[PDB]
Amino acid sequence: HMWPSAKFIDGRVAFSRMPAERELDEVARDFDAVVVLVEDYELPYSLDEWEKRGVEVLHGPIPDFTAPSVEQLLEILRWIEERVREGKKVLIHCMGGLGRSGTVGVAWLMYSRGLSLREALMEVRRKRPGAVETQEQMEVLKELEERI
Ligand code: VN3
């Protein structure tokens, strides 16, 4: 049994909506690290709630319905990879589990598997229909595709 809102895009990495504080114990049973993409005002609890449960945080705030830069994306991907190499499972989350986190998940499959944007987008949207919500989110993935 695993937290049922985790949408796995490979064996070790998943994306999701925001976990409530009362869900963190269950999340922490399977995930060692979390990439938090919401801005501080969106958090209903301190990010220390993750750390105290043994879940290492990368806070990479992106305003809702906007896109990270390609440079930010590459930083997040290396951080995920570092933890996957240690045998850890990693969760990526935003608020809805669709746009910000879907964008990072697409980027992750491109980076980790060499998938085309099309292939990676199809797989992420099979896990969460509607993932990658805005034009600018699509554009930064095209920009990333050119560079990896
Ligand atoms: O809070 V999300 O960009 O689905």
Residue numbers in the entry: 0 to 147
Passage from the reporting paper:
In this study, we report the crystal structures of three forms of Tk-PTP, which showed that this protein forms a canonical DUSP fold and that it undergoes an atypical temperature-dependent conformational change between two forms. PTP proteins commonly share a highly conserved active site motif called the PTP signature motif, which is also present in Tk-PTP as HC93MGGLGR99. This motif, constituting the phosphate binding loop (or simply called P-loop), contains the catalytic cysteine residue (Cys93) that functions as a nucleophile for dephosphorylation and the conserved arginine residue (Arg99) that anchors the phosphate group of the substrate during the enzyme reaction.
To validate this hypothesis, 0.6 mM purified Tk-PTP protein in the final purification buffer containing 50 mM Tris-HCl (pH 7.5), 200 mM NaCl, and 2 mM dithiothreitol was heated at 60°C for 3 hours to induce its conversion to an enzymatically active form. Simultaneously, sodium vanadate, a widely used PTP inhibitor targeting the catalytic site pocket, was added at a molar ratio of 1:3, to prevent this protein from reverting to the catalytically inactive form during crystallization. Hexagonal prism-shaped crystals were obtained with the heat-treated Tk-PTP protein, and its structure was determined to a resolution of 1.8 Å, referred to as Tk-PTP(form II) in this manuscript. However, the P-loop conformation of Tk-PTP(form II) is quite different from that of Tk-PTP(form I) (an RMSD of 2.39 Å over 8 aligned Cα atoms), with a flip of the Met94−Gly95 peptide bond and a remarkable shift in the main chain backbone atoms of Met94−Leu97. The Tk-PTP(form II) P-loop is structurally similar to those of catalytically active DUSP proteins such as DUSP23a (an RMSD of 0.29 Å over 8 aligned Cα atoms). Consistently, the main chain amides of the P-loop of Tk-PTP(form II) are directed towards the interior of the active site pocket, similar to those of DUSP3, but remarkably differently to those of Tk-PTP(form I).
